[PDB]
């Protein structure tokens, strides 16, 4: 491999696609109130590129079939943003979430603390993961090492963002979603023809083992490379199986409620629509599109394990370092090996071009949002008398610091949680996210909390999560032959049984602290909670829609279509749990 790209039939395809995208941006640089179809594609492609092509396919090739029930929970939580939470942001005159928590409670410490937390979550979750995924794609396709691929990815995204790649982010986004969704079905059709149908795919996956199992003297265990006994179950054992069904339903809901409703890019995307019917149309279209990645991206991971078993399922550490560069595991190369070694001479370049052009826009979006969040909300509250030139050079001397810190952090990403990228992202989110959602829901619905409770709730949740996160990396997670010497009190349970405990403890602390101090009168709290959302008086506080009005026909049509989408998702969940296979001894 690695010399299958050196032909004249697809280098021209890569060059022509990149010149087309840069020409579209350079034309839209010279010469608000959107409609339903751009919002749907902009919401469906938010985390694709590194949370669809690496994480889902690798955990499908390593664990089994239960990973695919992530997007169905995501669409159920996507229907709540349009119907419940966006009229709260419109009816209060607010754009983002810390600007809501400044107008609700008061003071100046909650906003600064939430900005400082959001920057660290950006660094740990998005930037280093995007750079690592781009380096994986370049190292599989061409053949250079890691340090010669990171600087190539950065030197291409700089040319992307110079020629107006942030203005025109609607045409190129709809184009990339359409081309990627069309091209991801032909690879499934090519994959299911190679193994020989759907029954031989079931019968052959349970015998995919490597043929080099021994060391020089350390013969490896029998259970360490054979597939699991429950690979075709959706709901697994709640005590001894990975991804257990209580965590799989409750902890993913707690982790998705923070991500879909209290974000910054998604909320400002939905708040820029023309009317209130178009937000709901855009929320229905992405929910219809999020039913596919079980059949499109999880099941080709198992085909990639079946066809090439000595690379994707290696176990001996003198052999796994030769193939993927790390001595822990090699499941991350499951999907980029299928694209290079099965596609014909034409589409093999177009798929790599689509994946890289979807990986660069995310990066520019993050670099712009973090620059605004640092300059406006932390640095301008220290000096208070800064001009525009000083703020421009401060905003431009910050992304260099972010890039250097993320590139330094990368060699911990590629060796965490035994070599999988789904578990790393979900465990970091489970340790740092759940104290925010409890304080958000208790601020909206209960009307009696004040500023003295929310701050100490956030601080105590931060202390617990940071203790577990520091103890996890300094001791390691463990292995197959030698388990880890973790203190097995805070380190014993699954990482999805930690989110529920942290959620409950943060809520209990803010209620107990809030019931011991002075309240806030309801003169200041008009149209800022759920009970007083329809008051008409004035409050003495501490192209563009502002009304949330709609015709009485399209309201009925949207209600009926949301009910039908919920029925389809429930039927899929009831199909894959009613007939699952059981092996014999």
């Amino acid at each position, epitope marked *: 491999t690695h010399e299958l790209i050196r032909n004249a039939a697809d280098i021209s395809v890569i060059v022509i696609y990149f010149l087309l995208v840069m020409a579209v941006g350079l034309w839209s640089m010279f010469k608000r109130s959107m409609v339903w179809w751009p919002i749907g594609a902009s919401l469906f492609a938010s985390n694709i590129g590194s949370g669809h092509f690496i994480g889902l396919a690798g955990t499908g090739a390593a664990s089994g079939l239960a990973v695919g029930g992530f997007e169905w929970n995501a669409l159920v939580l996507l229907l709540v943003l349009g119907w419940v939470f966006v009229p709260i942001y419109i009816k209060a005159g607010v754009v983002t979430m810390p600007e809501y928590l400044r107008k609700r409670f008061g003071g100046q410490r909650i906003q600064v603390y939430l900005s400082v937390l959001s920057l660290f979550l950006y660094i740990f979750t998005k930037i280093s993961v995007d750079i690592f995924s781009g380096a994986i794609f370049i190292n599989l396709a061409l053949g250079w090492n890691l340090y010669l691929s990171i600087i190539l990815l950065l030197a291409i995204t700089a040319l992307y963002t110079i020629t107006g790649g942030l203005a025109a982010v609607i045409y190129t986004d709809t184009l990339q979603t359409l081309i990627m969704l069309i091209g991801a079905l032909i690879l499934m059709g090519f994959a299911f023809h190679e193994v020989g149908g759907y029954d031989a795919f079931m*019968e052959k996956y*349970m015998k995919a083992i490597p043929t080099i199992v021994s060391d020089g003297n350390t013969t490896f265990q029998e259970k360490c490379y054979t597939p699991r006994a429950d690979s075709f179950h959706i709901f697994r054992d709640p005590l001894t199986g990975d991804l257990p069904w209580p965590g799989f339903i409750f902890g993913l809901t707690i982790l998705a409620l923070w991500y879909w409703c209290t974000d910054q890019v998604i909320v400002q995307r939905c708040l820029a629509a023309k009317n209130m019917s178009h937000v709901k149309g855009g929320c229905i279209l992405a929910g219809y599109l999020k039913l596919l990645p079980m059949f499109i991206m999880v099941m080709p991971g198992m085909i990639s394990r079946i066809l090439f078993p000595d690379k994707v399922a290696c176990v001996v550490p003198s052999e796994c370092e030769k193939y993927c560069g790390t001595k822990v595991g090699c499941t991350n190369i499951a999907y980029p090996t299928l694209v290079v070694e099965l596609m014909p001479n034409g589409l093999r370049g177009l798929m790599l071009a689509v994946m890289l052009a979807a990986l660069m826009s995310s990066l520019t979006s993050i670099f712009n949002s973090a620059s605004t969040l640092f300059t406006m909300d932390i640095y301008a509250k220290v000096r208070k008398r800064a001009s525009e030139k000083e703020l421009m050079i401060v905003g431009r001397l910050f992304v260099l610091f972010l890039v250097v810190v993320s590139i330094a952090w990368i060699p911990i990403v590629q060796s965490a949680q035994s070599g999988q990228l789904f578990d790393y992202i979900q465990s970091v989110s489970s340790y740092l996210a759940p104290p925010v959602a409890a304080v958000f829901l208790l601020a909206i619905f209960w009307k009696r909390v004040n500023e003295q409770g929310a701050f100490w709730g956030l601080i105590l949740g931060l202390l617990l999560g940071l203790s577990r996160l520091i103890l996890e990396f300094a001791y390691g997670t463990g292995s197959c032959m030698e388990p880890s010497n973790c203190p097995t009190i805070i380190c014993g349970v699954h990482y999805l049984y930690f989110a529920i405990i942290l959620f409950a403890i943060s809520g209990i602390v803010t209620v107990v602290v809030s019931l011991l101090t002075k309240p806030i009168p309801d003169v200041h709290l008009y149209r800022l909670c759920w009970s007083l959302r329809n008051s008409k008086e004035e409050r003495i506080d501490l192209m563009k829609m502002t009304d949330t009005s709609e015709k009485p026909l399209w309201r009925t049509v949207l209600n009926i279509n949301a009910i039908l989408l919920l029925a389809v998702a429930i039927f899929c969940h009831a199909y894959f749990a009613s007939n699952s296979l059981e092996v*014999l001894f």
Partner: nanobody
Amino acid sequence: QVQLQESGGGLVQAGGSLRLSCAASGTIFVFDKMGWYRQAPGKEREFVATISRGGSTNYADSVKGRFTISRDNAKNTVYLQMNSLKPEDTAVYYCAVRYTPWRRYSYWGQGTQVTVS
């Protein structure tokens, strides 16, 4: 590949008995609904007997009372004890299996010839 080996054909008189077997080999799973299907020479197929996994036998109304079918537990072997034979039920017999309750009869058997009188 999965293949079904069966045996137990022959020739009896009107009022005898026989014994038919079926045994899949080469798989790793447990089948759900191992059954039987007969077909007269020159006619169309029909249903005879069927036993599920936990045990729920489902006969046909024109044969109930004379046939008895039993399957071993947690493995793939199913018998059929036919009693008081007539010369009307002379046909070949197939053996069908199934993976899951909603998936429509994956593998079929070869065929065992049995005629009477």
